[PDB]
Amino acid sequence: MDTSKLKPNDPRVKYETKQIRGKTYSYILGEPAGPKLETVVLVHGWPDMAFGWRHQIPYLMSLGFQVVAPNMLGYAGTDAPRDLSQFTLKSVSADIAELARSFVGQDGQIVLGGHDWGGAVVWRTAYYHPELVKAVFSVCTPLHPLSAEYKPLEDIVAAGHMLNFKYQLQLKGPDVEARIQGKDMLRRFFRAMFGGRGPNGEAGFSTSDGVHFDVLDKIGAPPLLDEQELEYYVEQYALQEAPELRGPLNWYRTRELNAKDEMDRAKNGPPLRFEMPALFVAASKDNALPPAMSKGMDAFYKDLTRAEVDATHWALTQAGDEVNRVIGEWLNKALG
Ligand SMILES: CCCCCCCCC(=O)NCCCCCCCC(N)=O
Numbered sequence: 001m002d003t004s005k006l007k008p009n010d011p012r013v014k015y016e017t018k019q020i021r022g023k024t025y026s027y028i029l030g031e032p033a034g035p036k037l038e039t040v041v042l043v044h045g046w047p048d049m050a051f052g053w054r055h056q057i058p059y060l061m062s063l064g065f066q067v068v069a070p071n072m073l074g075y076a077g078t079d080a081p082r083d084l085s086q087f088t089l090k091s092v093s094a095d096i097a098e099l100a101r102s103f104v105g106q107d108g109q110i111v112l113g114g115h116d117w118g119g120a121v122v123w124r125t126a127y128y129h130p131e132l133v134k135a136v137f138s139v140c141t142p143l144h145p146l147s148a149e150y151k152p153l154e155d156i157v158a159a160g161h162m163l164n165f166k167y168q169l170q171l172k173g174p175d176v177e178a179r180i181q182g183k184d185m186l187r188r189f190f191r192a193m194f195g196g197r198g199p200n201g202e203a204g205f206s207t208s209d210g211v212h213f214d215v216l217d218k219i220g221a222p223p224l225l226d227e228q229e230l231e232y233y234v235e236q237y238a239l240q241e242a243p244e245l246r247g248p249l250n251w252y253r254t255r256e257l258n259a260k261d262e263m264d265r266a267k268n269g270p271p272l273r274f275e276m277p278a279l280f281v282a283a284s285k286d287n288a289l290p291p292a293m294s295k296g297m298d299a300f301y302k303d304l305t306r307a308e309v310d311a312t313h314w315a316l317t318q319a320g321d322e323v324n325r326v327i328g329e330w331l332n333k334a335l336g
Contacts, residue, residue, distance in 0.1 A: 001033045001062045005320065006054035008232035013057060013067075017077065020099045023086070026050075026077030027070040027099070030061040037064040038111050038134065038335065039104050041096060044069070045116020045141070046171075047193055047248050049076045049236055051229075052115070055320030056327070063328055065111070068103060070096075072118065074247025076236040087250045090261045093125040097132055109134040111331065115316055116141060116289070117251050126274055135334045137279035137327060139315055140286050142294035146266040150259035163208070164288055170210030172252040177243045179213055186234045186244060194222035194230070194314065207287050224314050274301045277334035281326055282308040283315040305330050 006013065006028075013030040028050045040060050044052045050069040060067050071078040073092055085091060100110045112133050114122030119141025126133040157166045170176060180189045192204020192211065202215040222230065237244050278301050282291035291308055298304050307326045311319040 001058075003058055003062045005317075006051065006057055008051070008228055010054075010058075012061075018099065018102055020102070021091075021095050023073065023079040023081060023095070024077075025070050025073075025079075025095065025099060027068055028053075028057060030057050030067040030069075032064045032066050033062050034064045036066050039066040039068060039100070039108070040111040040113060041100050042067065042069040043096065043112070043114040043118030043121050044072060044075075045114075045118045046251055047189070047237075047245070048116065048118075049233065051232060051236070052316060055317055056113075056324060059324045059328070063331075066103070068099065070099060071236075072121075074240075074250055076239050080240055080247030080250070084250055084253050085257060087254050088257050088261055089121060089124040089254075090128060090258075092121055093128045096121065096125050097129045100132060108132075111335075112136045113138070113327070114141065115139040116313070119289075120144065123274075126276065126278075127272060130276070133276055135277045135279075135331065136274070137281065137330070139281040139323060140283045140289040140313060142280060142282075142289070143272070143297045143300055146269075146272055147259040147262035148266045149263070150256055153255060164290065164293075165207070167205070167207050167210035167288070168252050171249055175213070176211050177245050177249050180211070180245050181243045183234050183238050185216070186237050187230065188216040188219055190225065190230055190233045190237075191219045191222045192216055194224040195312070196220045196222040224312070224318055272300050274304070277303045277305070277330075279305045279307065279327065279330045279334075281315065281323060282306070283313060283319075284308060284310045286311075286313040286315070288313060303334075305333075 013028050016029055017024050017026045042053045050071045053069045057067050074080045104110055109132055112122045119138035122136050122138055123143050126136045156162050196219040198215050198218040204212050204215055204219050240247050309315050309319045309322050316323055
């Protein structure tokens, strides 16, 4: 079995859809080499897609795992509902549970893995659906406690707090959705998000201000995507109806809806408490999700393995071989 990363439209995997909780979900499905050990479900974040797991998918297949990597709500071939309540962490966790059980049966279990917003999804999925999740891991995204209060992010950052998330104000508003439309702008956006730079070192993205629109036309080739990977992201994002980023950006519009869900759990539901084997892979150079943010995370876990790779936010690809090894060795211990 060939273990190198997926290429665009790689024939080693299948590309399918299923109706899941009223929505069409598209996904990558890779079948195990050998008798199946487990089914692994992998969950990307923003602005990624299932292909963001292209280093992990064939690796995990070669280890004996069936792999299901959906394009998440809003992305590529998956529906983008207009109703923001579909985008909450609880509703998307329920989508993941139904999709998982459509492969493993209602009584089955999965290994669950996430990155970025997907990392937040998978911790919530393990909390909402402990019947289903046998082991869970996240790259970059630490646990965050159940919301006990709702405060507008504008007020939080105006008091000088959570300043690494201030870019979420721009993303939640109209500017990015209105300006990044069509394949020409999508192409410049992805050159920016995957590290391309301008003639005087201009960056296309900052955690303080979000997308730097006025440098996008000067951004050069991204070091973290090759030319056909970049065009694949453009083509797949162009599957969404214009404005193409409405779906992905809806992940920034749910702070109040998620707070409503989680204030109820903070007062009446069970505590945030993970009894199943868990792994957290921090990324040293992620400015949006810095390792120090994982502070007192260990207190919420019976069995948390920690790792840290020296990589940017795009650790799944930039450090794909290292992340694969960390996951495989942890999974081997967790399952054995
Ligand atoms: C822990 C609190 C709850 C989870 C919050 C997760 C926030 C996810 C998110 O907003 N990710 C977007 C980052 C932007 C990529 C940066 C590209 C530029 C580059 N790295 O080259």
